[PDB]
C-alpha cells in the first residue's frame, strides 16, 4: 500500500 | 518525533526508516540507518537481506503496456539483516537503539554508507506525446527473505521503499560573476564593447535575476533588438559523453542603440516552470511517487575533480544577444547557480 | 538414415549434416558433429575451418537497401577442419564413421560442444510499417577454406546453414498454480475476496485455458465488469535489462457481481496467432527463412539461477482484472508455462 | 541454392 | 612557403601549425609538429599542454538547441609544452627550428606521432529533414594552459584547430576484375551465361566506368530490361558491427535479349554528386568547417589483417541486373576501388 | 577567429 507514520515511546 | 515505516503487502513483514531525505556536506554523507522487523517463526529456515541500489530508471511502474527503463545497475550493495551479523559499522546508532528498546528482540538494525562519488536524484519531464513516466535516476531501498541471494524474487516477501539525496547551498559567497566582450569592424577601428554583470554568484528560485548589461556603441552599426535569456545544461552521460540544452526563460526588448552612443541597463529575468509544462527534455528535482517540484537545484561538485560521470548532471548560464544590423550579431555568456537554501 | 547436405555456390566444397534441430536435457546438449567432403587438389595450399556462432540479428538477409543487424557477437566457436586435427573430442561419432565408409579418404569429420549457457532460438515478428525481417537470436554453421583464419571471406568458398535449437517438456509435473487477493475498503471491515486457480502448471498449444475464479463480494460497492487476459513477458538483455510485455488474448464478460454476494465461475481463454498478424513487437519461435510457426514457446531456466542473460528469455502470466464501481479496481495475477511437449 | 538429403549406404 | 597558426580568442595564446593535412603510406605517417607561441608573464604560475584526440562526433558545434554529438573518444594524446620538456622524441624538427629562430625564446616546440591503426577523416550528408551539421569522425588539436590535467577548461584559455587525414593511390595496379555467372533452368539443361569486366580496378572521380557485360542467353526465357547500378557500403563500427548501403548511381537500358542469342555490350556509369544533393546516409571527404567536397574516397586496408574496426570503413561495388521474365532474375556483382590519385 | 598565414625571415 502507502507509507505512515507511528509511535516512538520512551 | 515521527518514524516512518513500511511493511510487505502480506503484512508479516515490516521496516522502519527514521529519515526520508538525506544531505551531502561535500565531505561525509548522513548515513542510511533502519531497523527491520520481522518474527522468525514466518520463516524459520530462510535469511533477510536489505539492499541499496541506484539505476537509471525510465518510464513508469504501474503495468505500463510499453519497454521499460533501461535498467542500468549503476551500483548495489547488499548486507545481511538475518542470520544477525557482528557489531560493524561501527556501534549500532540511537535512533536503532530507541527502536530496539520499543520493539524488542525481533527489532535487527542495519547499517550503510554512501559512496561519496554519486550522482544526486533528478527526473526529467515527461513529454505529454509520450506515455507514462521519462527516464531519470532514483535511489531505492530493496528488503527481502531468501535462503539465496539469487533466490528468485517474490512480490509478498520483497519490500520498495524510495528515498532522496540532495544537497544545500555553502554558506560561503564565491567571486563576483562578470563578462566583457570587445569587437570591432572588419577593417576600420571602431569596435563595440559590451560588458554583463550580476548582482551575485548564487541566488534562490523565485527571485529575480537582475542583470547589470553595459553596452558602448561606439561603431557605425545600429543594433536593432535585444535578447536576454538563460540556458539550462544537462549532462547525461552513462556510456558516452551527452548534452541536453534547452531555454528556459527568455525576455526581449524593443530597444534601439544608435551608433557612436553608450547605452547601459538592467534588466529582470525570472526563472519558472508555468510556461514550460509542456517542453519536452526538462530536468526537474527528484520526486517521490509524481508530485510536482521546482527546477532541477543546481548540483554542485566536490572539490576533487575526479570523474563523477556517473549519471546526471545539470548547471544553468546566461546569455545575452545583440541583434546587429547587417549582421554582426554578438552574444555573451555568463555561468551562475541557482538551487535551494539550507533549512533549519 | 537420410542426411542432409548444403554445398559452396562453386559446387566443390559441400557440408553433410545429419540432423537440423537440436535439443537440451537440462544437464546435457546433442553434440553437433558432421563431415565436410572436398578434394584437397581444389585448394593444394589452404586450410578449412568449420565455425559455430551465435548472433543477435536483426532484418533479412537479401540486400536490403537498409541498415542491417547490430551484429553482436554472443559466442563463437572455431575448429581446424583441415589439415587434420588428433582424434578428440573424444572419438569419431558413429553417423561420421557411416558417412564416412560412404565417401571414403575426401571425408573429415568435426566436433563440437554447445556451452549450457546459451539462449534459445527465437524471432520477433516483424511489423508492416517496418522493411523485411525483425530482430532475432539465431544459430548459425559456417565453414570455409584460407590460409589464414582472419583471410578475407569469400563467397564461392564459405557456406553458411542455419540450425536450430530448441526445448522439451518435462516429464514431471509441478505444484498447483492458485492465487488469492482480499481488499478491504479505507474505513468499513467489509472486504472483497477473490481467488484465482488453474487445472494445472503446463499446457499445450491449442488447448483451452480452464482459469476458475471465485469472488467473494461481501462489500458495498458493485463489480461492473470483469475482464480476463494472459500476459507474454519477453525479456531483452543484451547489455542492459529491458522486458517488452505486449498482451495476447483477452476475454471480457458482461457479468454484474452485486454487492454482499458470492460468485464463482470458470472462463475459456485460448491464445492463438491468427487475431495477432499486425500487432509488432510479438515473440514467435524459431524460423528456418521465413516459414510460419505458433507462439513462442516459454523456454525453462536451468536449475543454477546463474545470470544466463546473454539473449531473449520469454514467460507468461495471466491477469483478472475486476471493474468496480467508483474506482477500487483489484486485478489478480498468476503465471504459467505454455510449450511443445516432448514427441518420440 | 537450398538444402537437400542424399543417400547413406551401407 | 607559408605557416598557418592560430591564436586565443584573448590573443595572447598563439599556436603555429605548418601542415594543415597529412597522409600515410601505408608503413609510416608524417608526424605532427609544431610550435607554440606565448609569453610566460601572463601565467606564472600555470603549465601549458597541447592534447590530440579523435572524436566519433555528430550534429554541429554552433550552440545548436539540440543534443549534441554522442562524443566518443576513439583516442587521446597529450603532451607537455610548458614546462619544456626532454629532447625526444626523437630531435626537433626543420621547420620547428625555422620557427624558433624565427621567434627566438618564448617559442616552445612540440611532437606527436600517429597510431597505425586509425581511420580516415570522413563525414555523412546532413539530411534536409534533420537540423545542423550529421555525424562523422574528425581530428582535433587541441592546446590549453593550466595547473592540472583536470582542470576546468576556459574559453579564453584553450584554443581548437581542425586537421585532416587522408591517403593517396599507390602506384602499382592490381589484377583485372572480372565476374561471371551461369544459372540453368530447373529441369532442362539450357543455361544463362552472363559475363561482366571492367577496363581497370583503379578508377578516378569524373572518370566514365566502361563495364563490359557480355550476355550468352542460350535459354528459353526472354530477358526484359536490363539495370546496372553501382553501390556504396559504408561499415560503422563503434561498439556493434553495421554498415549502411545505398545506391549512388543507376542507368537502365530498354534491352531485349531473345532467348538462344549472345548479346555483349559495353555500358557507361558514372558516380556523382549532383543528383543525391538529398540521399540522407550518403558517405563524403571530411570537410574544414562547411566546405563541399567529392563522394567519400574509398580507403584502403593496410597489409596487416589486424581489427581497425574503429570508426567508419567505406567501400564500392557495382551490380548488374537481368529482368528475366517469369521470374529467374540472376544479377552479377564486383568490388572495385575509386579514390584521388597522388598529386605533386 | 579563424586561421592566417604569416612571416618565415631568414
Request: with cysteine; charged share 25%; proline share 7%.
Amino acid at each position: 500500500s502507502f507509507t505512515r507514520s507511528t509511535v516512538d515511546t520512551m | 518525533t515521527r518514524v516512518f515505516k513500511k511493511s510487505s503487502p502480506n503484512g508479516k513483514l515490516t521496516v522502519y526508516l527514521g529519515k526520508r531525505d538525506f544531505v551531502d556536506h561535500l565531505d561525509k554523507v548522513d548515513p542510511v540507518d533502519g531497523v527491520v522487523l520481522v518474527d522468525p517463526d514466518y520463516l524459520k529456515d530462510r535469511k533477510v537481506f536489505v539492499t541499496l541500489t541506484v539505476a537509471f530508471r525510465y518510464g513508469r511502474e504501474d503495468c505500463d503496456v510499453l519497454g521499460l527503463s533501461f535498467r542500468k545497475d549503476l551500483f548495489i550493495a547488499n548486507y545481511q539483516a538475518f542470520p544477525p551479523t557482528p557489531n560493524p559499522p561501527r556501534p549500532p546508532t540511537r535512533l536503532q537503539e530507541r527502536l530496539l528498546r520499543k520493539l524488542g528482540q525481533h527489532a535487527h538494525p542495519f547499517f550503510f554508507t554512501i559512496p561519496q562519488n554519486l550522482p544526486s536524484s533528478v527526473t526529467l519531464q515527461p513529454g505529454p506525446e509520450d506515455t507514462g513516466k521519462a527516464l531519470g535516476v532514483d535511489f531505492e531501498i530493496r528488503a527481502f527473505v531468501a535462503k539465496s541471494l539469487e533466490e528468485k524474487s517474490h512480490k509478498r516477501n520483497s519490500v520498495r521503499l524510495v528515498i532522496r539525496k540532495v544537497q544545500f547551498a555553502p554558506e560561503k559567497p564565491g567571486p563576483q560573476p562578470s563578462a566583457e566582450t570587445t569587437r570591432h569592424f572588419l577593417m576600420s577601428d571602431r569596435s563595440l564593447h559590451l560588458e554583463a554583470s550580476l548582482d551575485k554568484e548564487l541566488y534562490y528560485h523565485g527571485e529575480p535575476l537582475n542583470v547589470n548589461v553595459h553596452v558602448t556603441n561606439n561603431s557605425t552599426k545600429t543594433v536593432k533588438k535585444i535578447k536576454v535569456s538563460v540556458r539550462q545544461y544537462a549532462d547525461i552521460v552513462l556510456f558516452s559523453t551527452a548534452q541536453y540544452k534547452v531555454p528556459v526563460a527568455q525576455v526581449e526588448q524593443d530597444d534601439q542603440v544608435s551608433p557612436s552612443s553608450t547605452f547601459s541597463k538592467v534588466y529582470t529575468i525570472t526563472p519558472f516552470l508555468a510556461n514550460n509544462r509542456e517542453k519536452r527534455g526538462l530536468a526537474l528535482d527528484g520526486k517521490l511517487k509524481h508530485e510536482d517540484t521546482n527546477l532541477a537545484s543546481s548540483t554542485i561538485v566536490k572539490e576533487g575533480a575526479n570523474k563523477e560521470v556517473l549519471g546526471i548532471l545539470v548547471s544553468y548560464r546566461v546569455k545575452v544577444k545583440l541583434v546587429v544590423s547587417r549582421g554582426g550579431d554578438v552574444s555573451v555568456e555568463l555561468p551562475f547557480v541557482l538551487m535551494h537554501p539550507k533549512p533549519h
